[PDB]
From Swiss-Prot:
Modified residues annotated as Phosphotyrosine in this record: 54
Cross-link (Glycyl lysine isopeptide (Lys-Gly) (interchain with G-Cter in SUMO1)): 67
Name under which the protein is recorded: Fibroblast growth factor 2
Subcellular location: Secreted; Nucleus
Function of the protein: Acts as a ligand for FGFR1, FGFR2, FGFR3 and FGFR4. Also acts as an integrin ligand which is required for FGF2 signaling. Binds to integrin ITGAV:ITGB3. Plays an important role in the regulation of cell survival, cell division, cell differentiation and cell migration. Functions as a potent mitogen in vitro. Can induce angiogenesis. Mediates phosphorylation of ERK1/2 and thereby promotes retinal lens fiber differentiation.
Oligomer status and interactors: Monomer. Homodimer. Interacts with FGFR1, FGFR2, FGFR3 and FGFR4. Affinity between fibroblast growth factors (FGFs) and their receptors is increased by heparan sulfate glycosaminoglycans that function as coreceptors. Interacts with CSPG4, FGFBP1 and TEC. Found in a complex with FGFBP1, FGF1 and FGF2. Interacts with FGFBP3. Interacts with integrin ITGAV:ITGB3; the interaction is required for FGF2 signaling. Interacts with SNORC (via the extracellular domain). Interacts with glypican GPC3.
Tissue specificity as recorded in UniProt: Expressed in granulosa and cumulus cells. Expressed in hepatocellular carcinoma cells, but not in non-cancerous liver tissue.
Family, similarity comment: Belongs to the heparin-binding growth factors family.
UniProt site positions, description: Important for interaction with integrin: 100-101, 106
Sites where the protein binds heparin: 8
Annotated segments matching region Heparin-binding: 100-116
Modification(s) after translation: Phosphorylation at Tyr-54 regulates FGF2 unconventional secretion. Several N-termini starting at positions 94, 125, 126, 132, 143 and 162 have been identified by direct sequencing.
Position of sequence motif Cell attachment site: 18-20, 60-62
Length: 124
């Protein structure tokens, strides 16, 4: 599994068993272990290992994690020039997976390039 360390505050992306998404700084949290699975080159799904749920971005920018894999569950994974990764919705293509400084997720419609919120380092 991987954990996704967000540059914005040092929060790891967390997927709760019930589908809620947020961030936490605890490396020991069971709900931050993720499986990043390649769908094709540069395209991934993000599954919470504990939750058996896949990260999804909704049409209004909400993040949540669903039991089923749908078209809202795929993301462009890009290694940026600063060597952080970004995860951009394959369906809503201007919007990024992001965490705010409070550890709450950032609405997709409020994200974009240049923001710290969208930058993640995957780690083992
Ligand atoms: C360089 O890091 C970016 O800016 C940080 C900062 O200026 O504090 C921080 O931004 C968040 O906090 C600011 C200030 O908050 S407050 O007014 O003191 O309460 C917010 O203005 C900002 O929200 S907003 O959408 O820009 O209005 C917050 N951004 S966050 O994504 O919600 O965290 C962040 O560390 C970072 O912002 S980022 O570049 O948009 O990620």
């Amino acid at each position: 599994p991987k954990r996704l360390y967000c540059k914005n505050g040092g929060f790891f992306l967390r997927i709760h068993p019930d589908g809620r998404v947020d961030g936490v700084r605890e490396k020991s949290d069971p709900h931050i272990k993720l499986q990043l699975q390649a769908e094709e080159r540069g395209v991934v799904s993000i599954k919470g290992v504990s939750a058996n749920r896949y990260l999804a971005m909704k049409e209004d920018g909400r993040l949540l994690a669903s039991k089923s894999v749908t078209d809202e569950c795929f993301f462009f994974e890009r290694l940026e020039s600063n060597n952080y990764n970004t995860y951009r919705s394959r369906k809503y293509t201007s919007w990024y997976v992001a965490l705010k400084r409070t550890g709450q997720y950032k609405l997709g419609s409020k994200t974009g390039p240049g923001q710290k919120a969208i930058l993640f380092l995957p780690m083992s």
